[PDB]
Design a protein around this motif. Structure first.
Motif, PDB file in Angstrom:
ATOM      1  N   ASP A 185       3.623   2.605  -1.352  1.00  0.00           N
ATOM      2  CA  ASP A 185       3.619   0.827  -1.131  1.00  0.00           C
ATOM      3  C   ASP A 185       3.280   0.550   0.507  1.00  0.00           C
ATOM      4  O   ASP A 185       2.890  -0.453   0.942  1.00  0.00           O
ATOM      5  CB  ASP A 185       4.830   0.172  -1.595  1.00  0.00           C
ATOM      6  CG  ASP A 185       4.718  -0.112  -3.117  1.00  0.00           C
ATOM      7  OD1 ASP A 185       3.652   0.559  -4.034  1.00  0.00           O
ATOM      8  OD2 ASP A 185       5.601  -0.688  -3.640  1.00  0.00           O
ATOM      9  N   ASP A 186       4.056   1.368   1.165  1.00  0.00           N
ATOM     10  CA  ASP A 186       4.237   0.961   2.461  1.00  0.00           C
ATOM     11  C   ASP A 186       3.527   2.246   3.675  1.00  0.00           C
ATOM     12  O   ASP A 186       3.492   1.814   4.839  1.00  0.00           O
ATOM     13  CB  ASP A 186       5.584   1.028   2.899  1.00  0.00           C
ATOM     14  CG  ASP A 186       6.379  -0.081   2.078  1.00  0.00           C
ATOM     15  OD1 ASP A 186       5.704  -1.037   1.602  1.00  0.00           O
ATOM     16  OD2 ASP A 186       7.494   0.301   1.994  1.00  0.00           O
ATOM     17  N   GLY A 187       3.222   3.264   3.054  1.00  0.00           N
ATOM     18  CA  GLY A 187       2.623   4.322   3.831  1.00  0.00           C
ATOM     19  C   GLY A 187       3.745   4.831   4.977  1.00  0.00           C
ATOM     20  O   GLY A 187       3.313   5.285   6.032  1.00  0.00           O
ATOM     21  N   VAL A 241       1.930  12.076   5.579  1.00  0.00           N
ATOM     22  CA  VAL A 241       0.807  12.579   6.694  1.00  0.00           C
ATOM     23  C   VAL A 241      -0.537  11.747   6.799  1.00  0.00           C
ATOM     24  O   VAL A 241      -1.119  11.581   7.889  1.00  0.00           O
ATOM     25  CB  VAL A 241       0.592  14.202   6.756  1.00  0.00           C
ATOM     26  CG1 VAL A 241       1.809  14.984   6.927  1.00  0.00           C
ATOM     27  CG2 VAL A 241      -0.188  14.482   5.567  1.00  0.00           C
ATOM     28  N   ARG A 242      -0.889  11.067   5.767  1.00  0.00           N
ATOM     29  CA  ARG A 242      -2.175  10.594   5.710  1.00  0.00           C
ATOM     30  C   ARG A 242      -2.007   9.564   4.520  1.00  0.00           C
ATOM     31  O   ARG A 242      -2.862  10.059   3.425  1.00  0.00           O
ATOM     32  CB  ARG A 242      -3.274  11.451   5.889  1.00  0.00           C
ATOM     33  CG  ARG A 242      -4.343  10.785   6.726  1.00  0.00           C
ATOM     34  CD  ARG A 242      -5.093  11.632   7.463  1.00  0.00           C
ATOM     35  NE  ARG A 242      -5.991  12.471   6.162  1.00  0.00           N
ATOM     36  CZ  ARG A 242      -6.957  13.582   6.642  1.00  0.00           C
ATOM     37  NH1 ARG A 242      -7.065  13.756   7.863  1.00  0.00           N
ATOM     38  NH2 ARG A 242      -7.180  14.181   5.642  1.00  0.00           N
ATOM     39  N   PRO A 243      -1.954   8.305   4.745  1.00  0.00           N
ATOM     40  CA  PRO A 243      -1.999   7.196   3.651  1.00  0.00           C
ATOM     41  C   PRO A 243      -3.678   6.787   3.940  1.00  0.00           C
ATOM     42  O   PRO A 243      -4.158   6.699   4.892  1.00  0.00           O
ATOM     43  CB  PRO A 243      -1.198   6.218   3.912  1.00  0.00           C
ATOM     44  CG  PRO A 243      -0.272   6.529   5.125  1.00  0.00           C
ATOM     45  CD  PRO A 243      -0.934   7.735   5.661  1.00  0.00           C
ATOM     46  N   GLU A 244      -4.225   6.212   2.606  1.00  0.00           N
ATOM     47  CA  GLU A 244      -5.449   5.788   2.602  1.00  0.00           C
ATOM     48  C   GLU A 244      -5.591   4.538   1.668  1.00  0.00           C
ATOM     49  O   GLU A 244      -5.267   4.937   0.349  1.00  0.00           O
ATOM     50  CB  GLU A 244      -6.696   6.692   2.286  1.00  0.00           C
ATOM     51  CG  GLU A 244      -6.653   7.946   3.327  1.00  0.00           C
ATOM     52  CD  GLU A 244      -7.648   8.975   2.589  1.00  0.00           C
ATOM     53  OE1 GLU A 244      -9.019   8.849   2.767  1.00  0.00           O
ATOM     54  OE2 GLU A 244      -7.318  10.010   2.175  1.00  0.00           O
ATOM     55  N   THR A 265      -1.900   8.659  -0.748  1.00  0.00           N
ATOM     56  CA  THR A 265      -0.817   9.230   0.311  1.00  0.00           C
ATOM     57  C   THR A 265      -0.683  10.461   0.120  1.00  0.00           C
ATOM     58  O   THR A 265      -0.177  11.123  -0.738  1.00  0.00           O
ATOM     59  CB  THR A 265       0.476   8.691   0.171  1.00  0.00           C
ATOM     60  OG1 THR A 265       0.232   7.051   0.334  1.00  0.00           O
ATOM     61  CG2 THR A 265       1.306   8.959   1.415  1.00  0.00           C
ATOM     62  N   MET A 266      -1.273  11.260   1.256  1.00  0.00           N
ATOM     63  CA  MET A 266      -1.089  12.881   1.401  1.00  0.00           C
ATOM     64  C   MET A 266       0.354  12.968   2.076  1.00  0.00           C
ATOM     65  O   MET A 266       0.917  12.139   3.072  1.00  0.00           O
ATOM     66  CB  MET A 266      -1.976  13.227   2.296  1.00  0.00           C
ATOM     67  CG  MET A 266      -2.737  14.275   1.559  1.00  0.00           C
ATOM     68  SD  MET A 266      -1.597  16.104   1.508  1.00  0.00           S
ATOM     69  CE  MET A 266      -1.228  16.324   3.321  1.00  0.00           C
ATOM     70  N   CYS A 267       1.222  13.873   1.583  1.00  0.00           N
ATOM     71  CA  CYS A 267       2.260  14.379   2.104  1.00  0.00           C
ATOM     72  C   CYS A 267       2.272  15.689   2.379  1.00  0.00           C
ATOM     73  O   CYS A 267       1.991  16.646   1.555  1.00  0.00           O
ATOM     74  CB  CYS A 267       3.646  13.820   1.328  1.00  0.00           C
ATOM     75  SG  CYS A 267       3.377  12.232   0.454  1.00  0.00           S
ATOM     76  N   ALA A 268       3.093  16.339   3.151  1.00  0.00           N
ATOM     77  CA  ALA A 268       3.258  17.564   3.932  1.00  0.00           C
ATOM     78  C   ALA A 268       4.368  18.129   3.855  1.00  0.00           C
ATOM     79  O   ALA A 268       5.304  17.469   4.347  1.00  0.00           O
ATOM     80  CB  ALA A 268       2.436  17.857   5.022  1.00  0.00           C
TER      81      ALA A 268
END
Length: 162
Positions: A77-79, A95-98, A111-114
């Protein structure tokens, strides 16, 4: 509504992700899970658990109870997640929301998470499913192929009305 086998065939059998699931976007709560070792739920969910809070210097500066669903919903929801994104007891960084990424004539919030040597893709469908796709670089998986796998599954969910 036997979802686990569907997650398995889309995200795990195809070999690009080590585990995967789907959560409800309304609350972040995982309702389906699968993994390469048939213990997907342990990889996708852990009951609320206390973890370190971290200062700007990377040092532990206190503790916090993590509700995993809250962190997943926050990331989508928030990035942004105030104390990390936690899935199956493992911490990830957003790490990278779009927002509104275009794939196959539909838009998805991604949303990419690492984490170290792996990651997770969170992909929200128009109807408020969140695909969760985990990859492990130690298993010869990578963020690119796992993302494509996650998008294909999100689009199948979309086309299926989820």
């Amino acid at each position: 509504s036997d979802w686990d086998p569907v997650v398995k065939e889309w995200l795990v059998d195809t070999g690009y992700c080590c585990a995967g699931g789907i959560a409800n976007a309304e609350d972040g709560v995982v309702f389906a899970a699968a993994a390469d070792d048939d213990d997907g739920w342990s990889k996708l969910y852990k009951d609320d658990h206390e973890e370190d809070t971290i200062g700007e210097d990377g040092n532990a500066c206190g503790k916090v109870s993590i509700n995993e669903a809250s962190t997943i919903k926050a990331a989508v929801d928030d990035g942004s997640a105030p104390n990390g994104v936690w899935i199956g007891g493992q911490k990830y960084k957003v790490v990278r929301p779009e927002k509104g990424f275009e794939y196959n004539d539909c838009t998805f919030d991604i949303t990419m998470c690492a984490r170290s040597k792996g990651g997770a893709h969170l992909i929200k469908t128009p109807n408020g499913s969140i695909v969760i796709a985990l990859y492990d670089e130690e298993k010869e998986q990578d963020k690119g192929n796992s993302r494509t796998s996650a998008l294909a599954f999100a689009e199948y969910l979309h086309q299926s009305g989820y």
